[PDB]
Amino acid sequence: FNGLTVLPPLLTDEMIAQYTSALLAGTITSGWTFGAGPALQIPFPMQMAYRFNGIGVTQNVLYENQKLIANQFNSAIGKIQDSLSSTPSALGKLQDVV
């Protein structure tokens, strides 16, 4: 009533979700090639082997320990949701703006 208004953003949340999903699919099915040219397919265990080789650990460390690494990754991903929910002040930076 006093002349102060709030305008809506140009990008709706659905568009942002589509962008994030596109990035996730590209980085899962292509590795890092989709950010420098045409997307080139590659199996995921081979991509993990090359990411292991990037940090100085040979490839055979992964191929002989695939199941253990997969289980560790799954458990680490699973714990994230409970960590986010249980902590009360996890998203403080985004709340301070509002």
């Binding site: 080139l40 081979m46 490839q59 191929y63």
Partner: protein, 88 residues
């Protein structure tokens, strides 16, 4: 390469971009004489009949030898291994 401009700078970046990709069949290791060979630098590829080892950002197939492979293991624990002869 840098260039000047009124109240600013202009960069000319040169970049290398791959193109004209091709499809291939790949395997993580090569079994031979009860030993598993892994590539040193490059991936394993096959046109349909024979096997080769090539680099990453370019298609340059080469014969598989023991100069560009290291064994380091056995042939019962890697998933997806495909046996083929490895020359010397």
């Amino acid at each position: 390469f840098p260039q000047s401009a009124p109240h600013g700078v202009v960069f000319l970046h040169v970049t290398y971009v791959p193109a004209q990709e091709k499809n291939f069949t790949t395997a993580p290791a090569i079994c031979h004489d009860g030993k598993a060979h892994f590539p040193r630098e490059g991936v394993f590829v096959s046109n349909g009949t024979h096997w080769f080892v090539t680099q990453r950002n370019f298609y340059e197939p080469q014969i598989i030898t023991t100069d560009n492979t290291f064994v380091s293991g056995n042939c019962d624990v890697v998933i997806g291994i495909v046996n083929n002869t490895v020359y010397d």
